[PDB]
Amino acid sequence: ELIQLVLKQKETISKKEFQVRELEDYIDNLLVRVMEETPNILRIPT
Amino acid sequence: YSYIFKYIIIGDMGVGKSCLLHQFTEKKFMADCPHTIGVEFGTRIIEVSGQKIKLQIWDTAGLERFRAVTRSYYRGAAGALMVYDITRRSTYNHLSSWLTDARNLTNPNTVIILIGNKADLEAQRDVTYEEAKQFAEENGLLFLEASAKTGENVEDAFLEAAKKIYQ
């Protein structure tokens, strides 16, 4: 038994949610610029 | 083509927004649509009152929360597909707040069409035709049920909107 990794796994999870929101913030800020300055980058397919 | 109409598609995660876009612009439900990261758009050229028009149709994940791309996403929109899942009331219950956002982030003559998607999933219906059609009229929306999967009413949804935006 060593039960404390629950607290530690919690810590870990919080850290990755921070990591995730960080990356979503980057993307968003990038996409603003891209949409203003070369929107065709975001076309599909090609 | 000699005019361009900007469309947005909006609605909760997993209603089929990406799959509608993809059914329209490649008549193919390839297939298990895997959730949208940031922002993309397709095009199709249509014809209205004998005039050729490029639809330019933007897709992103169901946000809700304000974000950096939000303003410019709505910004120039001539039409908006507002989409719910026919098998999930929650997605339908949220329509009114989607319409709110839509209405203050686009121009007032922006044409908005309500899509109840996944009409193929009859067995799992969680929302009536009639009550969705009611909401549509109360709110001066165009309304169709559709299926991105079968193709059913997908073309019609985009073209019905295009007429009301004009020749």
Ligand SMILES: Nc1nc2c(ncn2[C@@H]2O[C@H](COP(=O)(O)OP(=O)(O)OP(=O)(O)O)[C@@H](O)[C@H]2O)c(=O)[nH]1
């Ligand atoms: N049976 C059926 N499945 C559908 C239909 N439209 C979409 N799907 C499926 O439902 C799931 C979600 O569809 P998406 O088009 O990704 O929904 P979305 O609204 O783009 O998702 P987000 O990008 O996260 O907002 C996927 O598994 C699709 O394959 C439909 O008309 N019928």
Ligand SMILES: [Mg+2]
């Ligand atoms: Mg999507």
